[PDB]
Amino acid sequence: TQPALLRLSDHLLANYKKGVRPVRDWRKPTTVSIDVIMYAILNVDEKNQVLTTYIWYRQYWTDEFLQWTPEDFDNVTKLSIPTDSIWVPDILINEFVDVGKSPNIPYVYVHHRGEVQNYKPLQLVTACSLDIYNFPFDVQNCSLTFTSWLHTIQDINITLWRSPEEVRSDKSIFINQGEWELLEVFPQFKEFYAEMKFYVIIRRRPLFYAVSLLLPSIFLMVVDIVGFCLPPDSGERVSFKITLLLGYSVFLIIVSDTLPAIGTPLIGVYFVVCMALLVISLAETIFIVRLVHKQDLQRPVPDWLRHLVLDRIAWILVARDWLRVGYVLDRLLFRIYLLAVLAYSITLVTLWSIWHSS
Amino acid sequence: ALLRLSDHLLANYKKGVRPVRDWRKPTTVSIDVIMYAILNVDEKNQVLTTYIWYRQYWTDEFLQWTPEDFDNKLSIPTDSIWVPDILINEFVDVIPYVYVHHRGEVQNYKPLQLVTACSLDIYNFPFDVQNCSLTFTSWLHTIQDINITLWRSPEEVRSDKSIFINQGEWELLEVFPQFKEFSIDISNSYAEMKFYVIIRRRPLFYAVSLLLPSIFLMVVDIVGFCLPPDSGERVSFKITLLLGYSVFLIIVSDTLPATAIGTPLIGVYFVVCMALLVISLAETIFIVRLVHKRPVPDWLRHLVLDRIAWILEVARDWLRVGYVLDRLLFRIYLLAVLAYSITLVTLWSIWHSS
Amino acid sequence: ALLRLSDHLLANYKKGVRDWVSIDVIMYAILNVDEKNQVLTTYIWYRQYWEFLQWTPEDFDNVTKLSIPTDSIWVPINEFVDVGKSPNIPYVYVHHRGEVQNYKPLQLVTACSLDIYNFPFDVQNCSLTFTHTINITLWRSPEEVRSDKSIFINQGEWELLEVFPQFKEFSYAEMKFYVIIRRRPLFYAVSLLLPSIFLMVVDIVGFCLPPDSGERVSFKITLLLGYSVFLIIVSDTLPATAIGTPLIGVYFVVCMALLVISLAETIFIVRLVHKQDLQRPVPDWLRHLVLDRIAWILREVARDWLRVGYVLDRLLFRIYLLAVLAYSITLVTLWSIWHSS
Amino acid sequence: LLRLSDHLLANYGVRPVRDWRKPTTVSIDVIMYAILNVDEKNQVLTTYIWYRQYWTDEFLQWTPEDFDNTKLSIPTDSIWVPDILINEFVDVGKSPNIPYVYVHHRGEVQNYKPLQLVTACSLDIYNFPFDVQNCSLTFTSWLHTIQDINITLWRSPEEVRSDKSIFINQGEWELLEVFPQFKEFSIDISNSYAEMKFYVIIRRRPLFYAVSLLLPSIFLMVVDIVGFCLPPDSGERVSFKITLLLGYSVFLIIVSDTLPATAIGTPLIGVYFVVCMALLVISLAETIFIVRLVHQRPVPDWLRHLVLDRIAWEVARDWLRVGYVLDRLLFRIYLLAVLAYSITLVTLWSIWHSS
Ligand SMILES: NCCc1c[nH]c2ccc(O)cc12
Ligand SMILES: NCCc1c[nH]c2ccc(O)cc12
C-alpha cells in the first residue's frame, strides 16, 4: 500500500538501534575505509602555524542492520537516509583546530547488501609546523592524521579506499594555481587506536613574488651600483644616495605589510646589509663633502689614518689628502657592495637549486 | 485551517525519503541563478567572491491536497520537508523557510554569497576578460535520483543584468548556462548545470594611474636626447628620471597583480624600459667622464663604424662614439615605445570586441 | 522558595498570551560605515520594560526579585539587515508585582542612505526604527535621549551629535529614532588633505622654473609620477576604486589634467627649440591670438616660437592658480558648513 | 560517573542557593595570550584571552560514597552560568567552543574558555611610535546587583599582575602589566553593582618604525642641512633641492599612508614632517627666486631695512647680500627644527622605556 521507498525507510529506521557499533558479531571489529582528495590550500599562516585547506573527504563502511532483500520493496537496491539518524564512524582529525563553514550534507548513501558511504566536503584549519626560511622558494611538509576519537583499533579499523599509490598521485581535481602547488598526499598507517596519517607536501611558487620582491630589489641594487660611478666630491651623489635611501625605506614599508614574516635569508641580505651599506656610504659622503668644501684646514690628515688607508688600498688595488682618503674609502665601499650583490645572486641561484626545478 | 494543513503535512512525512511516488523516476530540480554583484576577484588566491540570488523549485508528488479542504499555498519553517543535494562544485567558503503549492510543488529562494574558485588569467591587465564558471551538481545522488533543469529558457538567462549592481571594478557580460552529464561509470551518471559567468575589467583607473605615467615617462625619456646635449646637462636629467622611476615601479609592483602563470603582458615593458634607462644613464655617465678630464681601442672604433654603417683630439673620437651609441639607443627607445603602443592598442581591441 | 516560585510562575504563565511596552535605547559605538552596500554597523544597548507572575513576597519567603530563563517566555528593527555576533543572553528579569525587565546589547547591521558628496566634511542623518497590531513607548522624554550621547565612545571616526525619537502609527506605532553622525575630518588631515596641499604647492614652485630648461621637464614628470602614486595610494582609503567623486574628487583630476597639459607643452617647446633647421614659422594668426591673449592677462623663428610657448605657459600658470584658489575656497566653505551645522 | 550525572540532572536554570538569605559569588581569572591587533583608526583593541571562572553551586554536590570515588564533566548549556559579561566589548570573534563544564564534588564548578575578545579602547597615539597604552577591559553583571551576584578574584592581585608567562611576547606590542582593581558600581536600580576592572598595559616595539620612518626622516633633514654648503646662488643647489623635494614628496605620501590616524591628534612626530616639508619648499622657492634675479632691490623700505636690522642679532651688490642673509636665516631655522625633532625623539623614547 505505502510507497516502497517509504516502507523501506520505516522498516530500516524505526527499528534501528543506535548501538556502539552496528555489528551483530560484537567481538570482532568493523572496517572503515577512508579516502581524501585535496582541492586547494586556501591559506597557510606562519604566525598562527595553521594551514587552511579544502579536502573532499569520503568514508566507507558496512552495516549489519541496513541490509534487505531487493525481492521486497520492489526490487530496490539503493537508498539514501539522513546522516545523524544512523551511526557513523567516530573518526576525527588528530590535528584540526577548526572546520570552516563547509556545506552541510545531510544524506548518507546506503546499498542493499549493507554498504554505507558518507561524502562530505571539509574545510579544515589544522595546526602544523611551518618553517619559513628559503622564502620565496619554500617547501612545506604539512601533514594530518585521522584516528578513532574514542574507540580503539579492536573496535573500528581505518584503511584506505584506494591503493596508496593512487592516493599519492596528484589527483586532477586540485586547483593548480596561485602560491602553493601540491606535490603529493603520502599516506601512512601508524595503528597506535587506529591512526591514519597523510603527508601533504606543498611547495611554494617563487615566481609569485617576481614583481613583489625580486624585481624591485634587483633594480635598487643595480641603481645603487650605477650611482657608485658618480663622483663622490659633489652634491650629485648625495642627492642620488638620499633619494635611493628613501626608495629603500618605501620598499621596506611596502613589503613589510605583504611579506610573510624575525629573519629570512632573502631578507637578511636586503636590509641588514644594503640599507646599512647605503647609510654608511651616505654618511661618509656627507662628511667628506662638508669637510672639503669648508676648507678650514682645522686639522691635517692624522698619521694613523694615513698609514691604515695606504695599507688598505692594497686590498682593492692637505684637503687633497682628505679628498684622496675619501675616494679610497668610496672605492672600498663599492667593492663591499659588489661582494654583497654577488653573494645575493649566488644565494638566489643556490635556493633555486634546492627548490629543484628545470 | 492552515494549521490543520501543517499538521496533516507533519503527520506522515519524514525527511529521509525522496518526495517521489516511483523510486525509479528521478526528481527534477528546476534551477536559476541571477548575478547580483561581484564583490572581489582575488588574482593571487584565484577566488571569485560574488553575490547571487539563487532560486530553485522541484515537484513533490506526495504533497498534493485540495485547497478548499483547508480554507484554501503554504510556508513551512526550518526543518523543512526535504531539499535536494545541489552544491556549487567550486565552493571554498561562504531564508529559513520554503514555499509549497497545493498542486504538489515546492519553492526555495536564497541570497547566497560565494567564495568561488576560478581560473584567473591576468595577461591582458588592465583590460582583463574573465570566464568564471559555476557548476551546480548533485553531490551524492545520481542521475536516476535528481536531475537539474533550467527554470527559465537559456536565452532568458543569458542576458539578464537588471538586478546586477553595475557599481564596482568589474562588469558583467553574460550568464550562459549549459547542461552536461558527468559519468564516473557506465551507470551512476551525475547531472551538472554550469553557469559560465563572463566578466570584464574597467580599465579607466589603471589607464590613468599606470599606463599614463608609464607612457609619459617613456616619451620624456626619448626627449632626453633631443635638446640636452650628448654630455653635461643630460646626466642630471637622467638621474632625476631614474630616481622617480624607481619609486614609481616600487609602487607599481605593489599594485600589479601576479599569478603562478606570470606577470601581466604590460608588466614586461616596465622592466624593458628600466633596463633601457639604466643603460642610457650609465653610458651617458661614461661619455661625460671620458670626454672631460683612455686607449680608445681601435677595435671598438671599428665596431662602432660598422654599426653606424649598418644603422642606415681623441675626445672627438670619443664624441663620435658617443653620438653613434646615442643614435643606437634612440633607435631602440623608439622601437620599445612603438611596441608598447601597439600592445596597448591590441589589448584594448581585444577587451572592447569581447 | 526560589524553585517553588519558579515552578509556580511557570505553571501560571503561558507563551501565547501577550481579553485577547517601554523602550530605552543607548548608543555605545559606531562600527564600519561606508558608501558601499549602504550599511550602518553599530553597537547599541537596548533596555526593554513592560502580570501572570504577580505574586506576593510574603507567601514566597519574602522574595522580591527573581530571574527567569528566556526559554519559551513571551516578550514584546525596520532597518534590519543583520544583528551580528551579539551575545546570547539567556536570562530575563521579573519583579514581584509582575514588572519585567530585559536588557541586551546588539551589534545592529542596518541599511541606510549615506552621502559621500561632502567627504571628508560629511554630516549624515541616519535613523533607526522600532516596529501583532496596535503599543510601544519610551522610558524617558525625547529630550532625555540626547544626554545619553555622553556615554558614547566618541573618539572614533564619527561623532554622534544627537539621538532624537519620534512616534508614528502602526500602518507597531512605528517608533522613529533619528541619529546624526558627523564625520571627524582630522583623520584625513594627514591622509588626504596634507598630500594634496603639498603637491599643489610644489607644482606652484615648479612653474617659475625656466620653461625651456631640462630641469623643468624632469620636475614636471617627477611630479606626474608623484600624483600617480598618490592616486594609487589613497584609492584604497576611499571606498571607491576610481576617484570617489565627492566635491573634492574633482580637484584630484583638474590638477593632474593641468600637469599633463603643461608637460606636453614643455616637451613640444623644447623639441622645437632643439630643431635649429628651418621649420614652419609662427603663422600670423597664432601671433595675433597670442598678442591678444597676453595683452588681456598681463634664431628668429626659434625666438618667436619660444615667446609663444612662454605666453602659453603663463596662461597655464594663471589657470592653475585659479584652480588652487577654487580648491582652497571650497575647502573652507565645506569646513564652515560642517562646523556650523 | 554516568549514574551520578543522571541523578544530578534528574534532581536538578535557576539561581543556585538561597539568595534572599545568602548572596552567591563568582570568581574570575584572566590569562592574556596575545594582542592580535590594536586598531588606531577604529579605536578597538583585539586580544586573545584565556578566561577562567568558578562559583559555588548547591545542587551539584555529592560524596564518593554515593558513587564510587570527586570530579565530573557536565554539558555547558543545561546548567546555570554566572552571567558575566565584558562591557568594553564589541565582537565575539572566532574561538573554540567548549561543550562541557567541570564540577567538583564539594560544590565547585569550574569553567575554562578562550575568547578572541575585541574590545573598544581609548588609544593615545600622540606618542607614536614609542607608544605605551593603558587599555582596560572590565567584567560586570547587570541583571544581578552585588547582592544577586558578587564578583571576586581567583587569586591574589599581585600574582595576576606578575603572571604573563603564557603571553606569546611576539609581534608589535609587548605586555607590561595586567593588574586588576575591584570597584562597586552604584546605580539607581540598586545601590551597588559588582564589577572587576582589569587594566592591560601594552607597549609598542619601535625598531621597525625607528628604521623605517625616523631614519630616512633624520637623514633627509641632515642632507638638507648640508645642502647649504652649496652657494646660495647658482643652479647647483637648485638641482640638489629639486631632487630632495621630489624625493620628499613621494616619501611623505607613503609616510602619511603609514601613520596612525586618531582624531584627538596625529602623532607628535607628524608635526615635524610637515615642518620640514614647509622648510624645504621655502628653501627651494628662495633659491629659485635668487637665481632668477642674478641671472635691483626696488623696495628698500621693506627689503633693505629688514636685512640691515636682521644681522644685528649691479645685482651682486643689491640682491646677493639679501640672498646670503636669507640663506643664513633659513639655515638657522633648519638647525632649530632638527634640534627640536631630536629632543622630541629622545623624550618620547625616555617616556616609553621608563614605563
Ligand atoms: N565528490 C565526489 C563525487 C562527485 C560529485 N561531483 C564530482 C565532480 C568531480 C569529481 O572528481 C567527483 C565528484
Ligand atoms: N541598569 C543597567 C546598568 C548597566 C548595565 N551595563 C552597564 C555598564 C556600565 C554601567 O555604568 C552601567 C551599566
Author numbering:
A (entry chain A): 8 to 199, 207 to 275, 278 to 333, 422 to 462
B (entry chain B): 11 to 82, 85 to 106, 112 to 310, 315 to 333, 421 to 462
C (entry chain C): 11 to 28, 32 to 33, 39 to 68, 71 to 96, 100 to 154, 158 to 160, 164 to 200, 207 to 333, ...
D (entry chain D): 12 to 23, 26 to 82, 84 to 309, 314 to 331, 421 to 462
List sentences from the manuscript.
We demonstrate that the pentameric ligand-gated serotonin 5-HT3A receptor (5-HT3AR) can assemble to tetrameric forms and report the structures of the tetramers in plasma membranes of cell-derived microvesicles and in membrane memetics using cryo-electron microscopy and tomography. We purified the full-length murine 5-HT3AR in a saposin lipoprotein-stabilized lipid bilayer and performed single particle cryo-EM, as we previously reported. Further classification of the tetrameric particles, without the application of symmetry, resulted in two structures: a near-C2-symmetric (which we will refer to as symmetric) and an asymmetric tetramer. Both conformations showed tightly packed transmembrane domains (TMD) with a C4 symmetry between the membrane leaflets.
Our dataset of 5-HT3AR, recorded in the presence of serotonin and without extracellular calcium, should correspond to a desensitized state of the receptor. The distance between the extracellular domains for the other chain pairs B/C and A/D was too wide to form an LBP. In tetramers, the displacement of the C-loop and of the interacting residues were minimal for the LBPs of the asymmetric tetramer and LBP1 of the symmetric tetramer. The serotonin poses were significantly different compared to fully functional pentamers (H and EV1G). The ΔiG P-value calculated for LBP1 of the symmetric tetramer was >0.5 (i.e., 0.59, Fig. EV1F), suggesting a non-specific molecular interaction. Significant differences between the symmetric and asymmetric tetramer 5-HT-bound forms were identified primarily within the extracellular domain.
